[model samples]
Target chain A: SWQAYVDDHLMCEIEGNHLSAAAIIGQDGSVWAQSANFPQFKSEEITGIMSDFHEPGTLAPTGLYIGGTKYMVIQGEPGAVIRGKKGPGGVTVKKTNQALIIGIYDEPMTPGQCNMIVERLGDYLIDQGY
Target chain B: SWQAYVDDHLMCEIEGNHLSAAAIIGQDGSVWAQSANFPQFKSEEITGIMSDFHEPGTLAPTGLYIGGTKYMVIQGEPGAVIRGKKGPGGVTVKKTNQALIIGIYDEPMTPGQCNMIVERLGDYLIDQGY
Candidate 1:
């Protein structure tokens, strides 16, 4: 059901640009949908982030690990969104009702551009009560 | 010392526009400096925010009360920055070495505009080891 949205909408090229990886993760860190390029990572860290949303600085020291890459958190909102940046790339995680809309981007893709797309999709899912 | 910066620089007209209020608060909620228009608020809540930066959702229930206005937090970073929005205006708080650089803005102003000024001053303070 949601997988189609991930494959067709999130992963699909928009003006010939697409995210490096993306996924719709359940509250328990279960994978609902993820692009083919989505990292072959596990759920421990994802779950950790979900649980740490209510505790801000609890995870700053460890940073965020996604796809085996470590990212330093740059901005966050309690129970809403958390963003992390590395060098020329970063990750954006937006929380919906029951899912976490995740997106990863790198060089050639601006943080604002990636945020617009990721947050838009997350908003859409929230509207649909996902 | 710092009051001069707040009154002369932060409160001064920025191209004919200015922040509704601003302050530089210490980690202990002590006001190091604040614009004249800054809130007539106290330190309990300020200290609360500093202590809760490590714990996110702990404050959403109460929102952020500054200048007698309640604002919903829109963004935050562990031990770094926190932003709240209400009506047409919002508040931005950035943590430096020993103080919180804060700014409040309303209509005729944008979040980005306020962020730039507040964060710029915060960065300057951090650079100077404030």
Candidate 2:
């Protein structure tokens, strides 16, 4: 229910086989909701990757390879939300009460863009009481 | 045990949960063997990733998100014989009797180093009749 809710609000325009599909996954790496068919992926696999979403700092898009594939991963770790405003160096934040856990999957989108998208969506969902 | 065979020759040094494993898998994505504890990965998932290892030109380390993890995939496709030498653009080739499928897993190493490693290991294997 919430996942579909997550999808409708955030899954924006992103295409391509390698860089397509969007989903709201859990900390355990479960696919909560997806824009389309992103394909079957092990929970452990995704969780392992998300673990590093905040490595180079929040909403950072890092390069990686797993299971023979490549991805430009932009991760938003679990935490609170505040506002959807960009910080210094052009980074943004929208963390508030229950906006801790967040994720978006796609072959497209950059670190800044992905974070900005999350901030926008998180703010929307939080405001709408989702 | 070509998986082990491949490991002995290749699988030099890769670390980390996201990219801490190495294997010699088929087009079907079956892992022959891995260097260390690479963890459990479905053949299909691995196969899914290897599919795009050639995009953006061969041996090009493209960023990818598969099974939720990030990767810097540098693929050496399965093919015929050729000597190990870097091309004009510094691109290298080391195809031989059977060098079609090649992959490396590590949170470390860059795109250039990844391809060069294949050239070095692939040539050594061909020479040793592996």
Candidate 3:
């Protein structure tokens, strides 16, 4: 169910698997579902991200840490989304009522492409009352 | 003065006249300072934008209207920045404690370039306790 949304829906949609990873996480950092190759993100980092969505200012300064990579937050919309960049790859995080949809993309994918995928999925989940 | 920030600082920084117009308006939609060529934006539209920053969900659907032009909103961060694109031109709005720093850019100016200019100015204003 939720895992299928991660594997079949989110991850598979990105051509060439340029979407390096994808996940649906609970607000509290609990994993709902994640692709097999998804990096092992720390619970504390996820919590920090969730907290920053409420305050907005925090993410701009501290940036974002996912697994072994660090992303410099380029854009953030409080209570909705945060986008970060690191070299040729980047991360897009969107918040819904109860979960966070995260997508990490590499060189062949532009930030807009990643955003489109993540936002479309996030909107669908929001519509589903997530 | 505040007017200088709009003219000497903001508008002058964008190479060429690609920055078609600029303004620093109060959170309540009152004009603090605006460039000579700045379009006559409706007060109701400005108010709607400020309100959307609080709720963070209203802009994506209706997009943004400034003067006679309408730019489809592409990216937004509540209470921080809202970016809209219309053809080869776009609008970038950044919020501070007291004012909204706005920059409208035309073709030959990439969104990244516009964002850097707007965000840098917004950050400077925020540091000055705007």
Candidate 4:
């Protein structure tokens, strides 16, 4: 139970030049992302921002940083996966210079599976080359 | 988090003629099984009985059942794979007709990754042919 939580925590805090503040922020938000933010909200509004942001039991609040670049944080749980995409927005455009597209959970992940997550995030960063 | 709990509960309650009561007792004991049953205890004694049994936050109590054959319950957490084996004992021998050999959460597991657990347990039961 806690191991998956720990894995997410570790992967989110990994050290890498490719990582950026916006990316970190995006990733943290991806993790533990839910879909019940607004019951009557349109799909466009839901896609515009992280409408699923909510605090987990004891996990730290998802954080963002900008170490030479922007980073985002995300969380994951059983069966659910997080995804991120840059669109017309203040933070999104500012972070990716265009629109940052990152996959959150997308699929289930196990503890000690941080490497897989890191790989996925790394690939996204590589695609953007920032 | 909830998914793993659900899977364990489902696997424990699966209906089958091959399954029995003792196996259910043992399986429920295996899931979410902790080692802190006693701070200071020898491994051999620990192996003697299911000492790692603990109730998950909201998960039901691990149950046991006996139909055509005996069955045991077990739980798994990230990295901790449950393993059961037959050995000299009261419940163990009675259930398996020997010491019930069931692997516990020796490593870890992810949500939705239960077929692997079922396969492993099925193998153990197949070896006994009851």
TM-score (C-alpha, index-matched) for candidate 3: 0.49
lDDT of 3 by residue, B1-130 (tens): 7776676545543323336778888887788889888998774688778767777768668777877578888876877898899888898998888888998888887675566556656766686688
Query: Against the true structure, what is each candidate's TM-score?
Result: 0.48, 0.28, 0.49, 0.19
Cα-lDDT of candidate 1: 0.74
Separate DockQ for every predicted complex? 0.02, 0.01, 0.02, 0.01
Off by over 4 Å in 2: A1-130, B13-20, B42-44, B53-68, B72-111, B122-130
The reply for model 1, stretches above 4 Å from the true place, is A12-16, B1-130
TM-score of chain B of each: 0.86, 0.45, 0.89, 0.21
Docking class of 3: incorrect
Ranked by lDDT, the better of candidates 1 and 2 is 1
Clashes of each: 0, 29, 1, 88
- Lowest-lDDT window of 10 residues in candidate 3 chain B? B9-18
Candidate 2, A1-130: lDDT as tens digits: 6554444434432111111334444545445565564445542444344434333343223333332234433333444421121222122233433333233333344444345445544544454454
Give the docking tier of candidate 1.
Answer: incorrect
| TM-score evaluated only on chain B, model 3 | 0.89
What does candidate 1's lDDT look like per residue over B7-120, in tens digits?
Answer: 655554432456888898887767888887787765467766776576766676778877567889787676678889988899988888878889999868777657665775
What is the CA-based DockQ of model 3? 0.02
lDDT of 2 by residue, B80-116 (tens): 2111212221222344333333443332344344453
Cα shift from native, residue A3, model 2 (Å): 58
Highest-scoring model, lDDT: 3
